[PDB]
Every structure is written in structure tokens, then in C-alpha cells.
Amino acid sequence: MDEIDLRILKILQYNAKYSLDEIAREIRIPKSTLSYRIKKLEKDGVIKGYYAYINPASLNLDYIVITSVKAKYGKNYHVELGNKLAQIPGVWGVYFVLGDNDFIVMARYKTREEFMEKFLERVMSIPEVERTSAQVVVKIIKESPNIVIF
Amino acid sequence: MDEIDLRILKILQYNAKYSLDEIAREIRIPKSTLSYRIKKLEKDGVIKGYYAYINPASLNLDYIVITSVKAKYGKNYHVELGNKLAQIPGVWGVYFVLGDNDFIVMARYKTREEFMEKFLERVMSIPEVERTSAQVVVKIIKESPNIVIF
Amino acid sequence: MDEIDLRILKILQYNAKYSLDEIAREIRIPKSTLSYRIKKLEKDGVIKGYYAYINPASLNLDYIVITSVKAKYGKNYHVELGNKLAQIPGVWGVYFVLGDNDFIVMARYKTREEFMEKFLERVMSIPEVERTSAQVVVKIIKESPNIVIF
Amino acid sequence: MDEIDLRILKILQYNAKYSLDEIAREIRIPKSTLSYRIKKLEKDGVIKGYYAYINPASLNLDYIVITSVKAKYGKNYHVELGNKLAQIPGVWGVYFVLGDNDFIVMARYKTREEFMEKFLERVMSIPEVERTSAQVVVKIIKESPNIVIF
Amino acid sequence: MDEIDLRILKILQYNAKYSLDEIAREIRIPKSTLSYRIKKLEKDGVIKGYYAYINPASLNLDYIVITSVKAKYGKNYHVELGNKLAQIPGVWGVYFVLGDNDFIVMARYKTREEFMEKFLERVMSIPEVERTSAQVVVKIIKESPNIVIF
Amino acid sequence: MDEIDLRILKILQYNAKYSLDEIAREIRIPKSTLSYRIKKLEKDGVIKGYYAYINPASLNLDYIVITSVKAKYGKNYHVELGNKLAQIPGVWGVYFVLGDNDFIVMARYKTREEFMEKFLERVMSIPEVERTSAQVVVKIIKESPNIVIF
Amino acid sequence: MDEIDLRILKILQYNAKYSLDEIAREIRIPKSTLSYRIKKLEKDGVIKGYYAYINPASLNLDYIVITSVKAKYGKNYHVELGNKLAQIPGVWGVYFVLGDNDFIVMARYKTREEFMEKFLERVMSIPEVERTSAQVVVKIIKESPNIVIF
Amino acid sequence: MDEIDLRILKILQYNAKYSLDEIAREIRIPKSTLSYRIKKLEKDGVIKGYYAYINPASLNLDYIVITSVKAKYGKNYHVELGNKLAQIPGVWGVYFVLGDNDFIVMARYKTREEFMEKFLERVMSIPEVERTSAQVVVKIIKESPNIVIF
Ligand SMILES: NC(=O)CC[C@H](N)C(=O)O
Ligand SMILES: NC(=O)CC[C@H](N)C(=O)O
Ligand SMILES: NC(=O)CC[C@H](N)C(=O)O
Ligand SMILES: NC(=O)CC[C@H](N)C(=O)O
């Protein structure tokens, strides 16, 4: 990757629906070269794909919760709990963090009831789980994970 | 929105690079009707846009940190700190949560040094900030915020 | 329920001993219509009943304690502990909360000894119980759960 | 108060809509004596009144939150914050507890938005307030504050 | 007990080596009446005895530690741990407290090594013990448990 | 101090009302030598005095509380708060501990009201005080500070 | 050890590569006496040896972590965990502390991956380990353990 | 640096008092080449020096404490506190850590009194300091910071 690829990615991270023309004109390079560079980035794994950005509100995903989960120590309990958490419907993020030394889980549901049935109740029945603390997000000030180039 | 729009969105959330043909054939509806429905979803704000999914690793974004921030109480301190946090380079997520009653900030940097210079040092100089706790993500088990329809 | 029912409920939540006359005169509606509306609210479950408000102090209920209880995770431990807590004499409130991710128990006793014998000792013998923290209420600034319409 | 008054109160705490007949027949005492005893209990302050029990769900009071509040120390800050908390619309309970050495606030709202506007935002602007932690009640296992005689 | 007994106790709590004369002259009552009152207080259990106040420093009791101990819940674990703690050499105080909902243990030792051998190591081997936190007293600002009448 | 003084102190710490005869007979030494040794211990400061042990229960000292107090840092705030705490009526113990890095205060009162008026309210008005946590002692398993020789 | 030995040690703790001449001239004593004193300090165990001070940065030891570890109570679990921790590659410090009543572990690794593989993963599989909290050192303000004489 | 330098450093980190002969014979390289390599490592900053390892016990450094320090946020308070901490006599380590988001300070003193006078009292008077928690090390299981090559 070179400076030019970065200029291309900086654009595609915001809007992937531009025409090779506009981009080429902005970056000041041959459209055939652009198309090539973009195809190379996809083959190399830099660009893993293209998604439609759906407004979670439009889907009534009003009950957002960030949950910290502590796993009991011993015989692979930690690694197994991570994958169990990632398969729960509504869970889009699972991170293991150093400090708290536990899992941070990001999930979205339409209501409290759905959250309890699909996430909370399920997580509570997991024996490996030592403890949890579910944080209710009452305000999304920002959420743009797509922006990787600042 | 109807059941059909959901089938369309469920596809576009994963791959927006399909052809109206394939989708139409899968959903079993006229391509002209599909194109219409999709254009309507965009005009209605359900589909806010289309992004390229860039692999953060490809950009050496190795230092990932989830930081909790406590703001001092009183005269609009809380709301102001939120926007200050969202403008920091490298910060893609800022949420205010109930329970901890503080801000949860998601950020990505190439190294510890960048993180300290762009995020930590800056956050420390903010007077409104009462306290913080930065969690180092040492493992991303899952991160698919684009998946809103399960 | 309409605006008129709300005016009726706003009154009955404070004093259910009024006469259909006074209320009718205040709300400015036929006494026969009032009686009907009230009977409908009872049949519909809005008005679950009428209670006498007894001053807890008059019963020497001097030892008030708000206890948080953490249940161990796994095989229905959580749901079972909740009902065990609600059957304890002196316990009038049991809530499961998100954040602390534990039960909050409200209880009233005449003395420390009664509290220990009827609540504390009993709760300690429950194996499902992971941990507890009992908060001693030394001052009731307000307690009007009957006021649901502000 | 004697054993007989307790039998009367034990009944009235559950249902104040009984007839002096039924109660008299159950307690086995003259209806004129009952009426007298009840009037005495009201004059003495044991029975502070009679309320209609309204099902909070019937009023869409779905967002229930138990909040702990820490007040800064010094010049009457503690006592003043207590009364400020009790005047907030939607707040039915305010207790000062020993141990946590802070205020426990019980509130009910129809939605997250109402809660934020009427409670959270208001509490955040109070300078005396050091810190808070709002617990989201996702399940009411029991709530019968009217039962003072077990 | 009357006002006079209190005046007697207020004196004896500070210095039990006074003569019945001095005390009688100070309290302004017959020495024979004093002797009687004091003998009555002993027979009644108010005065449980008379001790020599030994300066702990004179015995090289330099390592003072206040330890909080959490016992696991279930089958009489709590009550049993309390008595086990009270029999440890060097432990002069054991209290069960509400709030922390654990035992507070006061102990004194000549050195760190003695403390580790007689207290810490022993406490660690107790299975019922969930967790502990030992606070090192580096300054005794006051310690007059003998003063019960202020 | 020698082995013999220790045998004397071990006795006097439990009961200072023995006769020089009994003690001399038990220790197997001349009564004149005993009297001398004891007088020397008093002059040397080992024996600071003799107190009457009054049963706190006999004085209705039912509300026992162990309070941890955190002082703000800076200009002699710590040392000043310690002496302010030790002068509070009902407070018999004040220790500064390493770990929690705060003051531990032992106090006794007849009732909750007295505790609030004499201790809590007073402590809350102290500006230097950062935070506190008052632990309610609901059970004294042991309290023998007089026993310094085991 | 005398004042002169201290002057010698104060020098050798900083730089052990000086010549007996320079030191002798600085301390103002016969070189033969110096050599003797130094040999005595080594034989007596004061000087346990001489090491080369290697700059950790020069070895790419960029991932520094201070981890607190809580061991479960009971049958020698504590002492055994300590030695298990000290044998982990990359761990240079293991301390058992009073207060937190847990182990503090100092370790150094080249990267996050090495840290996870050699330390974290290994520690997680230890059953005796109750919980841990790994603190990421992002700045070494000072690290001179060799300086024992100030 | 190459594999050979590492073999040299691995030796010098343990014992810098070996002769170029022994080392050369062990590493199997010309003594003149060794001397050169070692001189290069010193000029390059890998080997910052050579110290005498003094047994802290030999200096009566019995009071070891690991203290966590929280600095108030705002105008360079954090960076300034770090250097203030590093200049305190007896302090050999100061680290700023991510997670706890505070300073970890390692210090050694002969007694509690010295610790209080040189460290604690001084740290308490620092206004920038928000809070601290000093952990008493009662057992050094391992302390070999000199070992950088495992
Ligand atoms: N930007 C453009 O469209 C130029 C294209 C270029 N001439 C080519 O060879 O494709
Ligand atoms: N799926 C298709 O391509 C059919 C298209 C449809 N016949 C139209 O009117 O556009
Ligand atoms: N408020 C009243 O009492 C009026 C009653 C009304 N006239 C009826 O039909 O009952
Ligand atoms: N229970 C009753 O109704 C009896 C009443 C009773 N005879 C009276 O004097 O009122």
C-alpha cells in the first residue's frame, strides 16, 4: 500500500457508491489504474467487502447494551466463553480486554424483553461465566466503525 | 418497511456489491421493483449509505482501547465532554451508559505512542473529565456492527 | 383509558375515600358515569384494588434495609433465588436490575435482632447466593409508591 | 394498639373495600366497636389514609430505575440534595442509607427518553451531586409496600 | 441504674484505683452506700471486672492490622468462621458488620513475621474464607474502648 | 521487663482485683518483690492504669458502627481530620491505615438517632472529609482489647 | 557494616566498573583495605554479585505489564501459586502484598502476542488463580532497583 | 545485535565479573572479538553499565510498599506528579499504567516510621494527588529485574 491507496480507501470508507470517474478525477489518476488498485486491495484483503449502512433506529434497535463478562479461570474456560458470546443473536461485538481482564460485549435489541430473552437469560445459564455487568446505552454520541483512516 | 424490505436489507448488510439480478432472483421479485424498494429505503433513511469494509489490521491499527470516562457533575459538563470525545482522531465510538453512568469510548491506533499522543494525553488535559479507565483490547473475537438483521 | 380516567386515577391514588359526589363535582361529570368509569378501570386491571396506608412507624418498623444480592450463574439459579427472596417475611420489594446485574431487596423489621433472624440469617444459608450487601436506611426522605400519576 | 387492631390492620392493608359487616364477622366483634377502632386508628395516625392501587404497567411505566446518589460533603449539602431528589417528577422513593453512605432513589418512567429528560439530565445538573449509579430494573419480582403486617 | 451509678461508672471507667473515700467525697454520698452501689453493679453485670491497662507499645506490639474477611455463603459457614477467627492468638476483636456484610478483625503482633505466621497464614488455610483485605494500622490516633460513658 | 513481669501482666490484664498474696503464691515470689515489680511497671509506663470493665450493653450502647473515612489530600488535611474524629463523643477508636489509605473509626451509641446526631451529621459537615462508609456492627463475636499477652 | 562500607556500596550500586584506585582516593583509604572490605561484603552476603545493566528497550521489551493476581483460599493454594508465577518466562518480579491481599507480578515482553502466549494464557489456565488484573505500563518514569542507598 | 551478542548479554546479566577468557571459551570466539563486541554494546547503549547487586535485607530495608497513585485531571497535573514521585528518597520505581490509569510506585524503607516520614507524609501533601493505595509487600517471591534475556 502506498499514499495513493490511502487516498482511495479514505474515500471508499465513507461512500463506496462513487463512480471510478469521480474518484479518478479527485485523486488525479487514470480510471484504469484506479480500478486496478481497488481490485488489488480486495485481493490483498485490505478491502474485505462493501456493506450497506443500515440505520439501527430504522429497525427499532432501541435497547443497546454493553456488557462486561468475567469468565472463571482454568481449563480453556476463557476461549470457549468468547465464541459462545459471539454466536448470540444481537451481539455484534466481543472483545477480550487487558486491565479488567474480561470480555466486553456489544449488543442491540428492539426492547428490554428481547434483550432478556436472547441475551441476558442465555448468558446467565452459561456456567463458565463468573459475573457480568450490563451497561445500558442511553445515548449514542458517535458510532462510525467504518472510519479507519483519519 | 415490509417483510420483503427486510430480506433485501439482510442481504445488503453483508454484501452491497450484488447485482439487482441476483438479488431479484433470490428474493423472487421484479428487478424494477427491487431497484425501487432500495431507492425508497435510501430516501427514507433506512439505508444511510454504502461503505467499503477495510480490515483495520491492514492499516496497522494494532493498539485498540475501550475507555470508560467519568465526567464531573454540574452545568452541562456531561454533554460537552461527549462531543469533545467524539472529535478525537482515532475515536469511532462514544456511548453514554446507564449503570456506570459514564461514557464508553472505542478507539483504534497503530501503536501505544500514537494512542498516548492522540488520545490519552488529550483526554487527561480535559478538566471536565473526573476519571478514566482505558481497557486494552488484546483480542477481537467479533466485530460486525454492520449486521443489524439477524 | 382517556384523559378523564387519568383525572380520576390522579385523585384515587391519593385518597380513595372520597364520595362519587365530590369527585364528580370536581371532574365535572355525571356521578353515574364516574361510577361506571371506575368500575371499568377495576375490571380492566388498571385499579387492582384499594389499600389502607399504614404508617410503618406505628408498627415499630424501625430497622429498614435495602439489600443487594448476587446470585451464582448457571442452571436457573437466578430465577429461583428471586422467588425465595420474595417469600421472606418482612420483604416487600424484590427487583432484578441491569448494571449491577443483581437483586435489590427492600425489607422492614422492628429491630436488628428480627432483621438478623428473619432476613440475614436466612439469606446467608441460601447456597445460590454468591454475595450480598445490606444497606441500612437511616432516613426515609420519601416513600410514596402509590403516586403513579404526576 | 392491641391484638385486635392488628387483625383489623392486617385486613385493611390488603383490601380496604370490605364492609364493616364482613370484617366484624371475621374478627368476631360488634360492628360499632370495629367502626370505632378504625376511626381511632385514623385519628392516632396508624392509618394515614386509603389509596387506590394502580397497576404501573397500565400507565406504561416501563422504565424503572433505582439510582444511588453520592453527595459532596460539607455545609448542609447532604440534606439539601435529599429534598431536591424527592421533588423530581417520577421519583417515589428517596432513602439515605448507612454503609454506601449515599441516597437510594426509586423512580418510574414510561420510556428511556422521559427518564433522561425528567430524571437523569436534572440530576446531572445538580452541583452538590458527587456521583450516581442508576440501576435499570428489568424485572419486578415483588412490590407490595402496602403489606406492613406479616 | 440511676444518675448516681453513672457518676460512679464515669469515674471507674478511667481509674479503678481510687479509694472509696475520694469517690464518696466527689459524689457526695456515704462511703458505705458507695461500696454497696459498686457491689450491686458487679452483681448485676454492669461492671464485669477490673483490668490493668497495659501499653501495647511496651510489649513491642508494633504490627497492628485490621482485617476484613468475607465468608462463603451456605450451611452455617458464617457463624463457624467467626469463632475460628476469635480463637486466633493476637486477635482481640471480631465483629460481623452490615453493609460490607463481612467480619472485621482487629489484631496486634510484634512483627510482620509473627503476623504472617499466627494470623495471615492461618486465615488463608481456612476454606470457608472467601476473601480478605488486611489493613495495616500505621497510626493509632485514639484507642480508649474503656470509655463507655461520655 | 523479664519473664516474671510478663507472668504478672498476664494476670493483671484479666483481673486487677487480685491480692498481692494470691498472685505472689501463684508466681511463687515474695509479696514485697511483687509489689515492687508492679510499682516499677507503673512508673515505667508498661501499666498505664487500671480500669473498670463496663458492659456496653448495660448502657444501651446498641448502635455500634465502624466507619472508614477518606480525607482529601493536601496541606495537613489528613492529620487535622484525625484529631477532629477522635474528639467526637461516642468515638473510642481512630486508626490511620495503610492499604485503604484512610481512617477507621470505632464508635458506640444507644440508638440510630444518637449516632446520626452525634457522629454522622457532624462528620458530614467536615469539609476535609472526602468520603465515608459506615459499617453497622450487628454482632460482636469478640472484644477484649485488654488482652495484650497471649 | 560501618559508615565506610556504606560509602563503598553507595558507589558500587551505581558503577561497579571503577578501579580500586579511584574509589580508594575518593573514600580516602588504603586500596588494600578497600579490596578487603569489598571482599568481606561479598562473603557476608551484602554484595550478592555484579550485573550488567541491559537497556530493556534495546531488546524490544516494549510490552510491560504489572499484574495483580488473587489466589483462592485453602490448602496451600497461595504459596504454590507464587512459585508458579515466578517461573513464568518474562516475569522478573513477584510480591505478595498486604491490603489487596494478592500477588503483584512484574513482567516484560516484546509484544502483545508474546505476552498473551507466555504470560496471560498460562496464568489463565492455573486453577488456583481466582482473578487477575493486568496493568499495562505505557510509561516508565523511573526504574532503578539497583539504588538501595539514598 | 546478533545471536552472539545475545549469548554475551545472557551471561553478563547474571554475572559481570567473569573473565574475557571464560566467556570466550564458553561462547567459542576470540577474546579480542569478545572485548570488541562488549565495547560496542556499551557504546550503542545496550549495556548501560555495571552495578553491584546489594541485598536489600543487608540494609534493613524491611518496609517495602507498592503504592498506586491517582492524579487529578487537567493542565499537566499527570506528568508533573510523575517526576515528583520519582525524586522521593526510597522510591526506585514509578510507572504510569493503562487500565487503572494511575501511577504505580515501588519503594523500600527500613521501618514504618521512615516510610511515613519520607514517603507517605510527603505524598499526602501533594495537591495534584487525588488518591492513593499503598500495598505492603510482606513477601518477595522474586525480584530479578536484571534478567532481561530468558
Ligand atoms: N480517468 C479516466 O477515466 C482515464 C482513463 C484512462 N485514460 C484509461 O486508460 O482507462
Ligand atoms: N428480475 C428481473 O430482472 C425482472 C425485471 C422486470 N421484468 C422489470 O419490469 O424490470
Ligand atoms: N354528579 C351527579 O351526582 C349527577 C348524577 C347523574 N345525574 C346520574 O344520572 O346519575
Ligand atoms: N357486627 C355487627 O354488625 C353487630 C353490631 C352491634 N350489635 C352494634 O351495636 O352495632
Ligand SMILES: NC(=O)CC[C@H](N)C(=O)O
Ligand atoms: N463517706 C464516708 O466515708 C462516710 C461513711 C458513712 N458515714 C458510713 O456509714 O459508712
Ligand SMILES: NC(=O)CC[C@H](N)C(=O)O
Ligand atoms: N508472698 C509473701 O507474702 C511473702 C512476703 C515476703 N516474706 C516479704 O518480705 O514481704
Ligand SMILES: NC(=O)CC[C@H](N)C(=O)O
Ligand atoms: N590507595 C592505595 O592504592 C594505597 C594502597 C596501600 N598503600 C596498600 O598497602 O595497598
Ligand SMILES: NC(=O)CC[C@H](N)C(=O)O
Ligand atoms: N579466546 C582468546 O583468548 C583468543 C584471543 C585471540 N587469539 C586474539 O586475537 O585475541
Ligand SMILES: [Mg+2]
Ligand atoms: Mg460498514
Ligand SMILES: [Mg+2]
Ligand atoms: Mg397503597
Ligand SMILES: [Mg+2]
Ligand atoms: Mg480495660
Ligand SMILES: [Mg+2]
Ligand atoms: Mg543490577
